[PDB]
Amino acid sequence: TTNDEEIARKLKQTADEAIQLFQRLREIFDKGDDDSFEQVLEELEEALQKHRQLANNARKNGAPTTDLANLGNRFVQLFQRFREAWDKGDKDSLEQILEELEQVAQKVIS
């Protein structure tokens, strides 16, 4: 098809990467180790940047966007706080911010 579907397909793919990766980060946090955790942490942020960049391109070409959410803004702003909490070592934040994140995700996917 057009390059506008390729963008629609990649928005959808990157959202699925983030959804997948957030589920795994979530449970490493109930388990695992800074090793895997920090690794999944960066994967999730890599997916979300791709998604964001794809979104800019769809907006440029005015592509007909079907956006499953926008707790998307909610999710991204909460994920930025989570990273600041992690990087600050602030562990009590981490648990609160991780719950809010799981709540947004489930609101979108269901």
User: Minimum distance between the CB of residue 88 and Cl ion, rounded to whole angstroms?
Assistant: 13
Q: Which residue is nearest to Cl ion (CB)?
A: 68
| Shortest CB 100 distance to Cl ion, Å | 6
Q: Could you list the residues that contact Cl ion (CB under 5 A)? A: 12, 15, 68, 96, 103-104
Report CA torsion sign: 57, 63, 68, 69: positive
| Spatial distance between the Cα atoms of 66 and 46, rounded to a whole number of angstroms | 22
Rounded-to-integer distance, Cα 54 and Cα 78, Å: 20
Nearer to Cl ion, 30 or 92 (CB): 92
Provide the minimum distance between the beta carbon of 20 and Cl ion in the complex, in angstroms, as a whole number: 14
| Distance of closest approach, residue 35 Cβ to Cl ion, in angstroms | 26
CA pair distance 35, 51, nearest whole angstrom: 25
Please identify, using beta-carbon distances, which residue of 35 and 91 lies nearer to Cl ion. Answer: 91
Nearer to Cl ion, 38 or 90 (CB): 90
